[PDB]
Amino acid sequence: SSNVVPLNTFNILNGVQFGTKFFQSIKSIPVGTDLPQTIDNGLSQLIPMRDNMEYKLDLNLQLYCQSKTDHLNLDNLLIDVYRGSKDEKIFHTSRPIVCLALTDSMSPQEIEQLGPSRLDVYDEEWLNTIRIEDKISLESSYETISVFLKTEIAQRNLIIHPESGIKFRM
Amino acid sequence: SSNVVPLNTFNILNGVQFGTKFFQSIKSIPVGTDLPQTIDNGLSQLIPMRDNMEYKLDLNLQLYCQSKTDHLNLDNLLIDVYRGSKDEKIFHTSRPIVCLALTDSMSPQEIEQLGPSRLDVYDEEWLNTIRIEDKISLESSYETISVFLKTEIAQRNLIIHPESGIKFRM
Amino acid sequence: SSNVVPLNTFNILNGVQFGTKFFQSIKSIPVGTDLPQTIDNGLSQLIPMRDNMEYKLDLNLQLYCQSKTDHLNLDNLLIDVYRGSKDEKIFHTSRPIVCLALTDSMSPQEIEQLGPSRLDVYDEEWLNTIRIEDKISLESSYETISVFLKTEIAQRNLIIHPESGIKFRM
Amino acid sequence: SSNVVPLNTFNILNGVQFGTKFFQSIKSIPVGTDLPQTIDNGLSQLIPMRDNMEYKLDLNLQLYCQSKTDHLNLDNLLIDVYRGSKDEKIFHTSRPIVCLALTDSMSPQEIEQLGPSRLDVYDEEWLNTIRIEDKISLESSYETISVFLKTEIAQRNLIIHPESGIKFRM
Amino acid sequence: SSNVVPLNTFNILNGVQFGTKFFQSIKSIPVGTDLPQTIDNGLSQLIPMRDNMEYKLDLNLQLYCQSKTDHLNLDNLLIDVYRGSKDEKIFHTSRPIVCLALTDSMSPQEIEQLGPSRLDVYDEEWLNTIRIEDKISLESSYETISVFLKTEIAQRNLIIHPESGIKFRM
Amino acid sequence: SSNVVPLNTFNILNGVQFGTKFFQSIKSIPVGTDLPQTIDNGLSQLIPMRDNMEYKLDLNLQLYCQSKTDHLNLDNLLIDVYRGSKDEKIFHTSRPIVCLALTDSMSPQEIEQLGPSRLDVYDEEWLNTIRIEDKISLESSYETISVFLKTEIAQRNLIIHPESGIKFRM
Amino acid sequence: SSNVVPLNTFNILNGVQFGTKFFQSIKSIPVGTDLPQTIDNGLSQLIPMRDNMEYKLDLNLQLYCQSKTDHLNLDNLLIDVYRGSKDEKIFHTSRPIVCLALTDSMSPQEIEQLGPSRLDVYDEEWLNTIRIEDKISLESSYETISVFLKTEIAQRNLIIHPESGIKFRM
Amino acid sequence: SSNVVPLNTFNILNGVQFGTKFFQSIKSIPVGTDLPQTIDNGLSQLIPMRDNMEYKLDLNLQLYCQSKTDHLNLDNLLIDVYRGSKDEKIFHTSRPIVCLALTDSMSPQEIEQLGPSRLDVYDEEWLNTIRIEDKISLESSYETISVFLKTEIAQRNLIIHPESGIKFRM
Amino acid sequence: SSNVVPLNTFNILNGVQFGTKFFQSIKSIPVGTDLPQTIDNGLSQLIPMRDNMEYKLDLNLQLYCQSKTDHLNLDNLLIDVYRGSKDEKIFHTSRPIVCLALTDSMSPQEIEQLGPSRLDVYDEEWLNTIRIEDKISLESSYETISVFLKTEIAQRNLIIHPESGIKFRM
Amino acid sequence: SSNVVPLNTFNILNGVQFGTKFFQSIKSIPVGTDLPQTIDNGLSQLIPMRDNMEYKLDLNLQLYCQSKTDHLNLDNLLIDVYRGSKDEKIFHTSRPIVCLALTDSMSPQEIEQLGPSRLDVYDEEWLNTIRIEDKISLESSYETISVFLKTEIAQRNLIIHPESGIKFRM
């Protein structure tokens, strides 16, 4: 029922005026066809959707923001969800995020408390968890879904966690 | 009754002599029409207002101030509310705010106390909560509402929290 | 009775030889007219005053001093109250104030004690509270009141708190 | 009886070879005239003195010394009291004072102990309290009183506290 | 049954547009032939696989990331598994990793806690453990298996732990 | 009996080869004339001395030494007492003194212990107390007394405490 | 039986493209000849081996890695064992090692705990213990054994412990 | 009996090849003449000595050594005692001394323990106490006594304590 | 029996390609001649050896390694023992040693624990004790013994302890 | 019996190729002549020695080593004792010593523990105590004794303690 589609199974088109674009097509199988699930293999996969039924989208997005040159330590992530005339926007939000700068270093105290592994320290300290739930609605009649992630203040390096994805709930 | 209109559903017009402008039109539906609410999708939406009745506005504004070049660590935010001759000002106030500078960094002690996540540290330390309540009154006869946020001392980067908005109380 | 007139309802005329000037006119309504109060909306408003009666002024002035270029950490604020020939001075005083410099930064210890919010630290540490009470007397016959705030040693940035104002007591 | 005359009611004439000069005239009202007091409004006021009677002067002088360019952290204040041929000196003294330098900054420990407000820290740490009592005698026959405050080692910024003044005792 | 094939028994082809490539051929012995194991000697060895049976691959990958010139302290490792027209991708994933920079040094406290040996400190602090399990499926009909490890943000030095390898489960 | 003559009632003649010179004349009133005392007003006053009787001088000298340019932190003060041919020396001594340098600053710990006021810290830490007692003898027949204070190693700023003076004992 | 051959009894040929080479010839004495042992004198000695019997090699390698110029604090040691056409490789492995940099210094705490002698601190902290056991097999028919130790990332100084050697087990 | 002759009552002749010279003549009064004492006034005084009797000299020498330019923190003081052909040396010794350098400053801890007064800290920390006792013998037949104090390594500033002198014991 | 020959009784020939050379001749006295001992006076002495008997050498070598310019904090000492065609090597070994660098300084804690004397701290912390025992054998037929001490990585200053020497056991 | 001859009673001849030379002649008084002692006055004195009897010399040598320019913190002192053809060496030894450098400064902790006086800190921390006992033998037939102290690594400043000397035991 709750088909989770990871973002690595989307088509990625990086740009400079719109940030990162996650677009993917939609396949509409008819009723009584045993809805399949999206294989979590990081391969471009068409999203299975019931033929005529409204689907509600839950966006789970974990990412690491890292500064390129400007080294500003706070930024605003812009999320824009589109759908298949031209594409019409159905959702837009902004989320303040923390971005790694070259002047940031772990204190020895942070190693002792947050975990000896330094990946754990970034997971508990710098990971940006963004969850848009019960806000996006999409129907299978539309044949395209697009997600835009753009940094507002400065152009930066975004490291999207592999488990980030959109949950297509019943 | 208490229709909350988030600021991301307003039309944004950034400038250099007036700061950021949040203008939006007003729709006047007649009585007995089941007042709708503003969908929190970040899309430009006309504000629903009762046909002939005085509305009181409560401005909730959470934002992150961040210095561009001047790096001054304190600023004065200027809030100016207009309405639809030319637009007439109905409210004006100033609020001192704290702005992130490139010379500011978290101490290890702040990580331990305010929260391991560094977004929590900014939320509890640098977030500017500004609440103008029971001070602004607007009637549905006027067909425009405008909010101006301008920094006085220096031109800066303002990161408005997504939950910031104006509450149109009964 | 105790009509509080905030300074943002005054007319502001910034200069370079006299500092900031807060001038505003006076309206003299006759007796038995239900003395109104000044609306705290930050809009230029004539001060209501009883037709023939001596009023005593209490100046409440909270402000943030911040250094522009000189970066001197102490200054002398000069307060001069005038009234409506030319304007005649009726009160003058000086108050030492603390001014933010670019070499000043919060210690981690100050965050823990004075409050996690950094605006609280400035409120409890750098805010200059100046209260002139029972020293200024003005009658409604005069049709102008002017307040001058000037820094003596150096030209600086003054951030006047929005609640600063003059209380016109019975 | 103990008429306190604040120094801001004197005439101030700043110079470069003599420092700051506080000169003011004297009015001699006759006996049985209900000796008035000096209004603490910071306005130039003639000092009321009994017609024929010796008055003893108590000089209360609180000030903030602040270095201009030399940044020396200790200085010698020279106090010279004159009276109304030319003016004849009747008192002279020197008082070592502490002067703020641009290399001085508060430790976090001083904030916790001496008071969260940084004006309190300067009041308890850098304020120079100078009290000359029972040393100066002046009669109302002389029609002028002059006080000179000059820094000896270097030319500096003196911030005289508003409550500083001369007490004309019975 | 669970034949573990270390990555040092693969053929290594370092590049600049695709990172490090681990390609190796597959030998298909028939049934009833006493499946041999891969000798852990770091020598190029053909992978033994049952003639007609689906094998599931478990990728165990421990590595040390170290910055060359860019000195960025966080990176995204890209894993792409291919198989033997041209090679078709069957799996792709990204894993955030921590990379040693020349500005990083051990604190004395880390020596006391994580172990006196400094290799233990890197093992418990900087070693990137990446385990893809129950996600990759490969059949012996295909005669080639390829693994690509590429750093996304910057070109870096990857030190693959000798025990890293792919487990060919029953 | 013990007439204390403060040094500010002497005539001061600063030089460069002899340091600071404190010279003053002597008045010899006859017996049975009610020996007066020296008024502590900082005005040049002739020293009252009994007509024919040996007087013993006690030199009390408190001063603040402060470095001009050389910034050496220790110096040798040279005291030479003369009397009224040419003047004949009757006493000479040297006293090591501590001199303020521009590289000296108070620690926060010194504020807590020696006193919150920073003038108290200099009084208890840098004030040079020099007391020559029962060593100098002068008779009223001689009509001049001269005291020379000169720094030996370097030319410096001496801040003589106002209470410093010579006690003319019975 | 377990003849231990220290590496200092090998022939050393340092290079730049292959690192350090430890090559030595093999003498094949016949059966019933009282197998001698290798004298631990650091002199080039032929390895005694039984005439026709498979020998298993256990490599014990303790070394100190020290950075020359690059100062990177982690490296990958490459071990390649050859034997006597051209030489054929029979074993290859990689071992991450810790390398001394010029920015590394002992904390006083490490002296107290790991031992007062500073050679003990390096022995317990920086010594790289590498033991390849039960992985290398060599027969006496081959007349040459070669061991290559090469640093992968950077060219460094390797200080091989004198007790390092290869154990030729029964 | 134990006539103490302070060094300031000697004739001082500073040089560059021999350091500081303390020479003074000797007066030989006959027996039964009530041996006088040397007045401690810092004036050149002939040393009283019994006509025909061997005197033993005890040299008490307290001094402050301070570096001029070389800033070396240790020196060797050379003491040479002569007497009245040419002068013949009767005693010579060397004493290591500590010399103030411009890189030396008091720690806050030294203020708390050794005394709040900074002259006490130098008295207990940098004062060089040199006492040659029961080593020098001089007879009144010789009419001259000379003491040479010279620094060996470098030319420095010596601040001889006023109580330093030679004790002429019975 | 156990004749200890200190290394200072050897002939020292410092070089640049071989390090320090300790060569000395051998005298062969016949049996029944009361074997003398080597006088520990630091003078070149022929080593007494029994005419025809194998002697076993025990090398005791304590030294201080100190960096000249390279300042590397770890080195490898190379010991080569020769004997009297050309000289034939009979022993060779390498010993890792710790070398003083100009960036190394004692902590105050090391003074308290390892001993107040700073020579004790070097004795317990930086002294390299090297003891080769029961490994070197030399017969009196050979008329020369040579010991070479050379630093491998860098040319350094070796301070050989005076008690270092070779023990010629029975 | 145990005549102690301080080194300051020797003739000193400083050089550059041999260091400091302490040479002095020997006087041979016959038996039954009441052996005198060497007066500790720092004057060149012939050493008294019994006419025909072997004397054993005990060298007591305390000195302060201080770096001139090289600033190396460890050195090797070379002691060579000669006697009166040319002079023949009878003893030679080397002693590692600690030398003051311009980068060395006392910690506040060392003042508290080793003694408030800073000369005590050097006495307990930097003083080099060298005692050669029961190693040197000299007979009165030889008419000259010479002691050479030379620093090996670098030319330095040696401050020999005044109590250093040679004890001529019975």
Closest-CA residue to C89 (of C79, C101, C97, C81): C81
**What residues have CB less than 8 Å from B111, skipping those under 6 apart?**
A107, A109, A110, A114, A125, B118, B121
Strand B74-83 relative to strand B88-100: parallel, antiparallel, unpaired? Answer: antiparallel
Measured in angstroms, the CA of B93 and the nearest CA of chain C are apart by 6
Query: After which residues do gaps appear in chain H, with C to N over 2.5 Å?
Result: 84
The minimal CB distance from E96 to the residues A8, A117, A159 is found for A159
3-state SS string for H75-120: EEEEEEEEECCCCEEEEEEEEEEEEECCCCCCCHHHHHHHCCCHHH
Q: Is J46 helix (H, G, I), strand (E, B) or coil?
A: coil
CA E101 – CA E64 distance, rounded (Å): 12
According to DSSP, the residues that pair with B65 across neighbouring strands are: B99, B158
Q: How many CB atoms lie within 10 A of CB C130?
A: 16
Q: Helix or strand or coil: residue B143?
A: coil
Please give the C-alpha separations between residue B38 and each of B6, B32, B168, E10, in angstroms, as whole numbers. 8, 18, 11, 60
Closest CA to B17 of B78, B101, B67: B78
| HSE (side-chain half, CA atoms, 13 Å) at G115 | 11
Note whether F27 and F20 are within 8 A (CB). no
Note down the domain range covering J55. 3-169
**Burial status of residue E31 (CB atoms within 10 A of its CB: 0-12, 13-18, 19 or more):** exposed
Radius of gyration of chain G (CA): 18
- Angstrom distance (rounded) from CA J45 to CA I139: 52
Tokens found for residue A147: 């997600």
User: Does D161 sit within 8 Å of C72, measured CB to CB?
Assistant: no
Chains G and E touch (3+ CB pairs under 8 A): yes
Helices (H), chain A: 108-114, 118-125
Which of H67, H106, H117 has the highest number of chain F CBs within 10 A, making it the mutation to test binding with F? H117
Instruction: Give the residue before each break in chain E, using a C-to-N cut-off of over 2.5 angstroms; say none if it is continuous.
Output: 84
H138-159 core/surface letters (b: 16 or more CB in 10 A; e: else): bebebeebbbbbbbeeeebbbb
Q: Which residues of G touch E (CB under 8 A)?
A: 71-76, 89-98, 103-104, 107, 109-110, 113-114, 124-128, 135-136, 152-153
Q: Are C35 and C140 in contact (CB under 8 A)?
A: no
Structure tokens belonging to residue C96: 């030492």
Rounded Cα–Cα distance for residues E79 and E61 (Å): 10
How far apart CA H160 and CA F76 sit, in angstroms, is 9
DSSP state at residue I98: E
Least Cα distance to D81 among D38, D140, D145, D124 occurs for D145
Query: Are β-strands E20-29 and E47-50 bridged in parallel, bridged antiparallel, or unpaired?
Result: parallel
Contact J119 H109 (CB under 8 A): no
CA G79 to chain centre: 9
Helix and strand element counts for chain C (H, E): 2, 11
Count of CB atoms situated within 10 Å of the CB of A120: 14
Q: Name the closest residue on chain E to residue G100, using Cα atoms.
A: E118
Round to whole Å and give the CA distance between I42 and I45: 9
Partner-chain contact I92 G64, CB within 8 Å: no
Three-state DSSP class for residue E48: strand
Closest to H4 in 3D by CA, of H52, H55, H51, H54: H55
CB E124 within 8 A of CB A117: yes
Residue pair I96/G64 in contact by the 8 Å Cβ criterion: yes
Q: How distant is the Cα of D67 from the closest Cα of chain F, in angstroms? A: 13
Q: Which of F59, F98, F127, F132 to mutate to test the interface with H (most CBs of H within 10 A)?
A: F98
CA-CA distance, F22 to C74, in Å (whole number)? 38
From residue A155, give the alpha-carbon distance in Å to each of A12, A103, A151, F170, G47: 17, 18, 6, 89, 64
Token pair listed for I17: 């390609």
Query: Angle at CA J50, nearest 5°, toward J49 and J53?
Result: 115
Count contacts between A and B (CB, < 8 Å).
72
Q: Strand pairing partners for D100?
A: D66
The technique by which this structure was obtained is: cryo-EM
Q: Is C156 helix (H, G, I), strand (E, B) or coil?
A: strand
Cβ proximity of H10 and H44 under 8 Å: yes
CB A154 within 8 A of CB A24: no
Q: Are E51 and E140 in contact (CB under 8 A)?
A: yes
Could you tell me where the DSSP H helices lie in chain H? Answer: 108-114, 118-125
Q: Do B124 and C102 touch (CB under 8 A)?
A: no
CB contact under 8 A, H128 and J119: yes
Measure the CA–CA gap between A153 and A68, rounded to whole angstroms: 12
Assess contact for J57 and J23: CB atoms under 8 A.
no
CA distance J80 to chain I (A): 9
- Cα–Cα distance, H164 to H162 (Å, whole number): 6
Chain F CB contacts of D136 below 8 Å: 41
- Total tally of structural domains belonging to chain F: 1
Looking only at Cα atoms, what is the longest distance across chain E? 58
Identify the residue whose tokens are 């299978």: A140
Q: How far apart are CA F99 and CA H61, in angstroms?
A: 23
**Cα dist from E110 to E64, E115, H105, I105, whole Å:** 18, 8, 34, 22
F71, F119, F123, F124, best to mutate vs chain D, most D CBs in 10 Å:
F119
C105 contacts B97? CB cut-off 8 A: no
The distance of J48 to chain I (nearest Cα, Å) reads 25
Q: From CA C140, how far away is CA C51, in angstroms rounded?
A: 6
Handedness of CA C112, C114, C118, C121 (dihedral sign): negative
Strand-pair partners of E95: E77
- Residue recorded with tokens 């790096």: B71
Going through chain F in order, the beta strands assigned E by DSSP cover 3-6, 11-14, 20-29, 47-50, 54-67, 74-83, 88-100, 128-139, 144-151, 156-160, 165-169
Phi, psi of H109 (to 5 degrees): -65, -35
Nearest C-alpha neighbor of F71 from the set F128, F16, F129, F153: F153
Provide the β-strand partners of residue G128.
G63
Residue listed under structure tokens 């508990």: A124
Give how far H17 is from chain J: nearest CA, Å: 17
Contact list in B for residue A110 (CB cut-off 8 A) is 108, 111
How far apart CA F139 and CA F56 sit, in angstroms, is 8
Distance from C-alpha of G108 to C-alpha of E108, rounded to nearest angstrom: 9
Q: Which residues contact J135 (CB under 8 A, 6 or more apart)?
A: I40, I41, J91, J93
Closest to C81 measured CA to CA, from C10, C25, C155, C138:
C138
Alpha carbon distance E78, E150 (integer Å): 5
- Closest alpha carbon within chain C to B125: C117
Residues of H in contact with F93 (CB under 8 A): 8, 42, 162
Distance in angstroms (rounded) separating the CA atoms of residues B114 and B125: 8
Which one-letter DSSP state was computed for residue J162?
Answer: T
**All partners of chain A with 3 or more CB pairs under 8 angstroms:** B, E
And the tokens for J164? 């250093």
CA–CA gap between residue C3 and residue A154 (Å, rounded): 49
What sign results for the dihedral spanned by CA atoms J69, J71, J72, J76?
positive
- Among I152, I151, I168, I166, residue whose Cα is nearest residue I64: I151
Q: What share of chain A is helix, strand, coil (3-state, %, to 5)?
A: 10, 50, 35
Q: Of B97, B169, B90, give the one whose Cα is nearest residue B130.
A: B97
**How many CA atoms lie less than 13 Å away from H47 in the CB half-sphere?**
33
Compute the radius of gyration of chain H from its Cα atoms.
Answer: 18
Find residue H68's DSSP bridge partners: none
Continuous segment of H or E residues that includes residue G119: helix G118-125
Alpha carbons within 13 angstroms on the beta-carbon side of residue D83 total 14
Reduce the DSSP state of residue A142 to 3 states and report it. Answer: coil
Dihedral (CA of B36, B38, B44, B49) sign? positive
H100 vs H122: CA distance, rounded Å: 10
Nearest by CB to D108, which of C103, C110, C126?
C110
Q: What is the CATH number of the domain that holds B160?
A: 2.60.120
CB-CB contact of I132 with I91 (8 Å): yes
Question: Is the Cα dihedral I147, I153, I159, I161 positive or negative?
Answer: negative
Quick count: other Cβ atoms within 10 Å of Cβ E2?
9
User: In angstroms, what is the C-alpha Rg of chain D?
Assistant: 18
Q: Could you tell me the resolution of this structure in angstroms?
A: 3.3
Q: G119: nearest CA in chain I? A: I98
Q: How far is CA C69 from the centre of its chain?
A: 24
Pick the closest to residue D117 from D131, D104, D103, D106 (CA basis): D106
How close I81 comes to chain G (CA, Å)? 10
